[PDB]
Amino acid sequence: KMNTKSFEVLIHSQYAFDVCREQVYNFEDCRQTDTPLPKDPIHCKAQAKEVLSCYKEAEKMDPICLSSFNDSRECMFKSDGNLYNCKTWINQYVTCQKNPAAFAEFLEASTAEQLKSKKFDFVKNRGHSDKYL
Amino acid sequence: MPYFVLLFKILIFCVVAIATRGTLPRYRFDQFTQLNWKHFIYIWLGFLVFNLCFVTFFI
Amino acid sequence: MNLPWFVRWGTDVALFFIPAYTFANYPTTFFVFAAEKRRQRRRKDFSDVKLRDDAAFSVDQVKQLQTKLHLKQ
Amino acid sequence: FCLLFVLADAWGREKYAQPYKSQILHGRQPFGHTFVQNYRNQATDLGRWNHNFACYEKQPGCGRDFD
Amino acid sequence: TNFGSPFRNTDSGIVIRDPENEKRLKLAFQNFWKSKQEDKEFQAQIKTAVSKDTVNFMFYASPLFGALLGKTYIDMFCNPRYFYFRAFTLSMFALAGYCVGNGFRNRYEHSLYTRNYHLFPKDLQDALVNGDARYCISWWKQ
Amino acid sequence: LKHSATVLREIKKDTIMMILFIIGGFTYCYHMRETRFQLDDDFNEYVNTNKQTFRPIPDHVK
Amino acid sequence: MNRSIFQLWKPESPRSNVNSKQIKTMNVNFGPQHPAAHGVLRLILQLNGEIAERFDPHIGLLHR
Amino acid sequence: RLYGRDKPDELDFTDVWESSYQNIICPEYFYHFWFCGIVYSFEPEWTINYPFEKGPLSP
Amino acid sequence: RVDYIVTPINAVVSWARQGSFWPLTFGLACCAVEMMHATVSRYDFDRFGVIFRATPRQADLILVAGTLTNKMAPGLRRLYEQTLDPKWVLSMGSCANGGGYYHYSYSVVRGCNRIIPVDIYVPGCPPTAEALMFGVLQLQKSLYRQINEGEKKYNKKDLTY
Amino acid sequence: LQMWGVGKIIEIKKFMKRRDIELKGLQRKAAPFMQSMNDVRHLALRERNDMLYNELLS
Amino acid sequence: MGDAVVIHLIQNVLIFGIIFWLLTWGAEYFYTVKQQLTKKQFYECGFKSISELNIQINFNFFMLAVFLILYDVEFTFLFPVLFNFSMFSTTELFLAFFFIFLILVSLLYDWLNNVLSWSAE
Amino acid sequence: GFWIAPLFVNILSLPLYLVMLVYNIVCMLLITLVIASITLIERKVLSLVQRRVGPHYVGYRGRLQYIADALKLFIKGIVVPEGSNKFWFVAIPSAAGAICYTFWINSMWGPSVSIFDLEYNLVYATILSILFSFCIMLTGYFSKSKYAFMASIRCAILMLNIEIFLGLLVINLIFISESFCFSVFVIYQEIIWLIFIFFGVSGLIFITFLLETNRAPFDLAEAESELVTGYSVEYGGFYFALYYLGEYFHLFFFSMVISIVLFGGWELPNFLYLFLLNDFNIL
Amino acid sequence: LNIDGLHLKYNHNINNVLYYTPSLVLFLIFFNIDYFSELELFLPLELSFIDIYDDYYEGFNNSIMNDFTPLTLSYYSINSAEFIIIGLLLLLGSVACVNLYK
Amino acid sequence: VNTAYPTPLKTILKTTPAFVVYFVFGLGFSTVIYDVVYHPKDRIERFYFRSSKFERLSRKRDEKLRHYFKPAIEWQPWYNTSTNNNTRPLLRY
């Protein structure tokens, strides 16, 4: 449907959740049910289509966001889909997408260490009390 | 990498086992079975119950 | 001319540890450069991605800013 | 002795706030457990079930959304 | 540290050591606190689990209590003829007391920067949550 | 196994100190649990800072 | 602790199957080439459950 | 107990504590392990290199 | 020719079997005490890679250390036959060599060589610990050299045939 | 030591749960889009199957 | 639990054992085995074994296996509650303690009757 | 080429299976070398405890003693007793060797550094141990030596005890980790090693380790004084080498298991600086 | 018991031809309880589509991490009566075993 | 000035070469396992069961789409092999 891979879809959604909020609310209300069992998608098809169209619209990004998007993708590749471990890079990508003009000064006020290649190896650096959940 | 420290610990425990073999005498099968089934099973179950109680207290 | 016994023992310990430590830290010996190249290839590009029409900064401007800031080194 | 101690402590923990009361006396189980346990339980009478958030209306903070 | 920062998984993936960034973030938050020091309403609405006076007293008293306990322990059980083990155990008790006090202080800091999260502006909130001070450029003089 | 006065005094002091040590350990564990409660409260406040919106269930659910 | 005399001993009654050797006892040649044996002891051992019952020592392997 | 198989008229809690120490926390795997493995290994080897050294003899 | 591969492999096999030379835990008389003395630290047998094994199946050397009696000769023969090949036999002590002090007895066999093929003899009564070590080392050297003692003849191309 | 270690393990578990709260929040943020894509694919397959069944059974 | 990789690894291990089989066969070239009367007979410490294949043992400790059969399942029943003890409630805690107490009582009865030791027959 | 490609679809994949086989062979050879080095270490440590040099002349300063002993065991000939069952006498050691060389699959060398993505590591260990005990019992039975059969019975008793002992240990351990995977233990052991909780039962942990490793005081099956050699009284050469290798494999891997589950695995002992450490860092 | 492995000299052919082969034939002919279960390959796998469906809302609402959840929900919540019955049964069985030994 | 080693340390050092050889072999084995499990994935992928339900679904969505969804939606009556050597069901029944 999107021709986009799962982790990239998650990264894009982490920002698109704030642009198509009304469509997301409509879809959620349509799928709401009195039991945990899922509702038939035939009823929510229209809301899903609207949400997907807005997601297509939102997936576009400014070129300045490319470095942040790439580092977030690398983090989400080295970690098998753990959004918490890579939220900082995803947060930077969301910030760049929201008002990208300020991202120029954001990058300008960068330290030498930050201005370095970002390599992720979780086996070498597990972290602190990482539950992987 | 983690396997460096893991190998260090494995070597330590292997040396401990070798020293224990060189030091301690040998048990009898009946003696060890009696000891186990009369004391150690109760010890293990009591330790498990204590752990359950402590976990319940802290949670 | 003589050296302390503990100095000699530390020399032996270093001889054992430095090679083992380096080997442990680099299990993929001589292929770290290949890993870096693969990571660079995985890294996406402006053409690969789709960009907004009302971009605050153009692709050339972003490239110039990255070159000025030395973002990747 | 440990059982008696923990039971006394659990009964004394009523002083603390609701989320920190003893789990012996207060239940905290997954949504799969709670839904089946309190589906038509008039004793609890939690109310309707929030499908996309997996909780009843009367449970504290059932539907918690961003912004 | 045992757990690291509560907002993010510290040293997860890539390990980052940026003392300049740490100093800039600390300076930004210090400037924020100094700027809002005079605001009586803002000071009134600040909350913490344990009082600052209480945590200071605990920090400065726990090591002393540990030292007293160690002194009693060595007096009761240790032979006065020797001193190496007595000094070691007294130091261990003092370090235990210092550990209790430092934990009190660190938990006070954690409560201060967690309960009062909503009072900070958006930029400072983002800077605190993330490891980068670039979200709060204006605060550290740039 | 008759015991002398000094040995009996040492045993009695050991028992007393063991009792005091156990009581202190239990008290410290109680304090640690209280600390855990405080940390949970702090983190709950932090998380709920921005998650303040509650969406009512649609009327069509019933 | 309760009594265990019956579990500990088993007498043999005349022409009785239950009070008799209901098993084929292990007749082992403990030694001479046995690490425990000093080297010249040929002890015919009647084991029943790995418990010695009957001893027949032969000690002439070092008669000189 | 030292003189025969009999037992004291009045047992004391010292025996209880000794039995608990011996059973619950088995000291054999620590006491002997240390005393032999870690300490006795510090002595020079008593071996004599026969091909290049000879043992003491007398005229 | 196979010799190109056989000879180096022969040397490797000889070296391995010399390094790992496990005798049998079998002692009959006072010479067993000397064998234990040779085993213990003062003359560490493990230095030359010889470790005693209880079962004959796991033994390379038959240390006949002590007197052999008529009542035991069938047992010694059975042990020798049951020991897995290849194997060597080392007689230790005068009693094992030629009957020793009891050569004029009515019960002692006049020598273990009458029942077993004795590869080597270690004179003594009791042989010293160093004497037993010397005998074992000489037997090891002979064993290493036994694989190729220059039996096969060299042709014009220096290859054995 | 047993009591203190159990308390420490419980503290670690509760910290893990605290971070799981934020992980669940992020997963909730990312949920609706993937759900919509999956629903669209499922409905496309259902439409294909319905067309095939109608053609075969009509 | 794994996948078909486990079966493929079993096959690979069999091939690795074939490697040792080749080494053992090649070793045959460096020794000769003579035929002797007692070279292929049971070893009984330097003498002929009187009995072979009639090696019945006395199973006078069978109560231990009997109780192991029960206690293995008793312990196995405790795994789900230990795994999901974070979900424990009043009922689950009571049931777990009830089961543990039952196991303890069974062990105590066994000790009282003295069936955990070797017997005459 | 269009009409020829289909013929090679299954022919082009055999090299991949060959590569997998080669990698498995390399891993097995490396673990065999590790076990040989462990044997040499055991000999040297016993020599130190007994105040003797130990292996010193098989290779310069005894550097190739294990190689020499392995080659000698290969060289030694084997003969099956006439009264024994020819098929089983060779079948049992083959299965024992296969199981021992399958042991290494249930090992982790990092957070997810394992040859296979196995979750029930403890279950695998228990099953493999039971299979090895089966093989030892069958060896003792089919070798009609009375000492071998008694060794098999002792092995059965040891297995009976190990069942309950290791089951209770695993029950206590899983109560914290909540999983059978070795990785889940290290995350909880990062701050403090799990052995601190079990400090009271440290003696029982040591007993469990020794019993599972079949070391003293639990060397009943292979008791060399009570029995001639044990279950291998009638086995020589590589048949006995396989049993020795299996015993050392079990020792090494259960040492790894104990280290991972109770001593932090691949986490450094940070508890030595617990007092000076800080539990949080807020800027 | 039966260490040597020698067993009773039994000939199964007589019973196989007298009673078991025809009875088995009749039972196989007249026995089938499977009502309408369909073999794999009965229809193309491409017609089945439910296995691809994923519920991401339930996924993020689910906090389970082990496959013992049904087992605990059965043994300790729903079938706790049978769990206690099994415990009592095992205790009584141990008592009966001890009495049989005596 | 005989700056020789202490007696205990010198005694201990005898067995050190065995430790060094053991470390060499163990590092070789661990690195071989790491490389074998790293090359196919270009990383040390976390175990599937060591992940949340949502993470598992996200990880396997792409594989499901590539292996089942596309053939299912592009299916034709004559695509299936006549030998019945088709892909097995995802949930085998």
Ligand SMILES: CCCCCCCCCCCCCCCCCC(=O)OC[C@H](COP(=O)([O-])OCC(O)COP(=O)([O-])OC[C@@H](COC(=O)CCCCCCCCCCCCCCCCC)OC(=O)CCCCCCCCCCCCCCCCC)OC(=O)CCCCCCCCCCCCCCCCC
């Ligand atoms: C085409 C490519 C070309 C590439 C470039 C060219 C080639 C480069 C290759 C470089 C590496 C080659 C190996 C060098 C070895 C040097 C040996 C040496 O120093 O000689 C003296 C040393 C003298 O030893 P010795 O005569 O036996 O001992 C005398 C007495 O024992 C008394 O002994 P002592 O008192 O003297 O003390 C003994 C010990 C004293 O040392 C210590 O005390 C410290 C060490 C022990 C640590 C213990 C930790 C655990 C503690 C447990 C508890 C406490 C202990 C006590 C316990 C009991 C207490 C009761 O000292 C040593 O022997 C230290 C030397 C360390 C050598 C190992 C180095 C590498 C190891 C890691 C693997 C590396 C992989 C490759 C990496 C490549 C990239 C860098 O020589 C030896 O005999 C060697 C002993 C060690 C075994 C080495 C095995 C090597 C096998 C070959 C491996 C090939 C693969 C790797 C290379 C691949 C190519 C890159």
Ligand SMILES: CCCCCCCCCCCCCCCCCC(=O)OC[C@H](COP(=O)([O-])OCC(O)COP(=O)([O-])OC[C@@H](COC(=O)CCCCCCCCCCCCCCCCC)OC(=O)CCCCCCCCCCCCCCCCC)OC(=O)CCCCCCCCCCCCCCCCC
């Ligand atoms: C978070 C969890 C943490 C763990 C939790 C654990 C909880 C367990 C609870 C349950 C158990 C409780 C146990 C309590 C026991 C105490 C009870 C008590 O008070 O009883 C009174 C009872 C009554 O005694 P008393 O009648 O008063 O008589 C006094 C004694 O005569 C004594 O006479 P003295 O005092 O005149 O002489 C003894 C004194 C002797 O002292 C000395 O001689 C000074 C030290 C000399 C060091 C020698 C080695 C130097 C090595 C240098 C290497 C350089 C190499 C350079 C080249 C490198 C090249 C690579 O020994 C010491 O006290 C040494 C203590 C200092 C150790 C070193 C520093 C370690 C610091 C650790 C980190 C601290 C960071 C803070 C945070 C901590 C957080 C946990 O006292 C005793 O029995 C005392 C026993 C003392 C034993 C000392 C043993 C030291 C360790 C020996 C190691 C040997 C290894 C050899 C090599 C091995 C190779 C494989």
Ligand SMILES: CCCCCCCCCCCCCCCCCC(=O)OC[C@H](COP(=O)([O-])OCC(O)COP(=O)([O-])OC[C@@H](COC(=O)CCCCCCCCCCCCCCCCC)OC(=O)CCCCCCCCCCCCCCCCC)OC(=O)CCCCCCCCCCCCCCCCC
């Ligand atoms: C004499 C006359 C001439 C005869 C000619 C004979 C025929 C010649 C060949 C003719 C045909 C040539 C065809 C060429 C074109 C086609 C090539 C092709 O299809 O491949 C492309 C194919 C796919 O292409 P690609 O994606 O571009 O590849 C990029 C990399 O895959 C990307 O790598 P990555 O970033 O993904 O990183 C992971 C990579 C990186 O991993 C590595 O391979 C790097 C190195 C890892 C650690 C190595 C440590 C080894 C030492 C450990 C300690 C041993 C101690 C005990 C032994 C004693 C040692 C003294 O690992 C792997 O891919 C997994 C492979 C695991 C290899 C297994 C371990 C190797 C050592 C075997 C040891 C055997 C036991 C000891 C034997 C003792 C004998 C005395 O690439 C591969 O799969 C490469 C496989 C390489 C295997 C390892 C090669 C050896 C490396 C150097 C070490 C040599 C040690 C020798 C020891 C000797 C001692 C005496």
Ligand SMILES: CCCCCCCCCCCCCCCCCC(=O)OC[C@H](COP(=O)([O-])OCC[N+](C)(C)C)OC(=O)CCCCCCCCCCCCCCCCC
């Ligand atoms: C691998 C085996 C290792 C075994 C090592 C054995 C070495 C020999 C013994 C050395 C003992 C050294 C003394 C300190 C030992 C650690 C004590 C401990 O657990 O405290 C950590 C604890 C740390 O707990 P904490 O984690 O709550 O610390 C504060 C936490 N924050 C930061 C969140 C506030 O220290 C204290 O807090 C002080 C004591 C509090 C009261 C309860 C303590 C219960 C356990 C006491 C055990 C005492 C045993 C020794 C008795 C005296 C012997 C002289």
Ligand SMILES: CCCCCCCCCCCCCCCCCC(=O)OC[C@H](COP(=O)([O-])OCC[N+](C)(C)C)OC(=O)CCCCCCCCCCCCCCCCC
């Ligand atoms: C040349 C003559 C050949 C004669 C025929 C060969 C006979 C071979 C007999 C043994 C192998 C049988 C293979 C077929 C069964 C595969 C079952 C299966 O699905 O497993 C994978 C399954 C994989 O399932 P999955 O969960 O990955 O799901 C697959 C998903 N789809 C359908 C989409 C592909 O295994 C598991 O699920 C769990 C792992 C099991 C690991 C078992 C390890 C122990 C195996 C011991 C076998 C011993 C055999 C030899 C000795 C005994 C006598 C036979």
Ligand SMILES: CCCCCCCCCCCCCCCCCC(=O)OC[C@H](COP(=O)([O-])OCC[N+](C)(C)C)OC(=O)CCCCCCCCCCCCCCCCC
């Ligand atoms: C991935 C890494 C792989 C590494 C593999 C490394 C393993 C190497 C294994 C080498 C094995 C060598 C075997 C030698 C056998 C001949 C000698 C012998 O046994 O002697 C006794 C007997 C001969 O005994 P004899 O009667 O001559 O007596 C010799 C004694 N003297 C000298 C005193 C007379 O062997 C024979 O019968 C010889 C003739 C027949 C065999 C001829 C050679 C066949 C080779 C087959 C190779 C098969 C390869 C398979 C590969 C695929 C495997 C999956």
Ligand SMILES: CCCCCCCCCCCCCCCCCC(=O)OC[C@H](COP(=O)([O-])OCC[N+](C)(C)C)OC(=O)CCCCCCCCCCCCCCCCC
């Ligand atoms: C899996 C392997 C085992 C793991 C076990 C878990 C770790 C436990 C660590 C030790 C904690 C203390 C336990 C109690 C010790 C009691 C000793 C005792 O009885 O003292 C009095 C004993 C003797 O006193 P006694 O009174 O008991 O007996 C003597 C009797 N009279 C008085 C008549 C003479 O004194 C000693 O010598 C004690 C020395 C203790 C030293 C222990 C060292 C152990 C080292 C190895 C431990 C394992 C390390 C693993 C490292 C892994 C790293 C990755």
Ligand SMILES: CCCCCCCCCCCCCCCC(=O)OC[C@H](COP(=O)(O)O)OC(=O)CCCCCCCCCCCCCCC
């Ligand atoms: C699981 C392994 C680790 C151990 C964990 C459990 C520890 C349990 C003991 C904690 C300390 C108890 C202090 C009691 C002080 C006291 O009253 O002390 C009173 C007297 C004092 O005796 P003295 O006058 O000789 O000092 O002691 C006693 O009465 C001894 C009581 C028994 C203690 C044995 C050890 C504990 C065994 C398990 C508990 C069951 C005991 C049953 C006894 C009949």
Ligand code: SF4
């Ligand atoms: S030769 Fe001498 S030492 Fe040896 S057994 Fe005969 S009498 Fe004893």
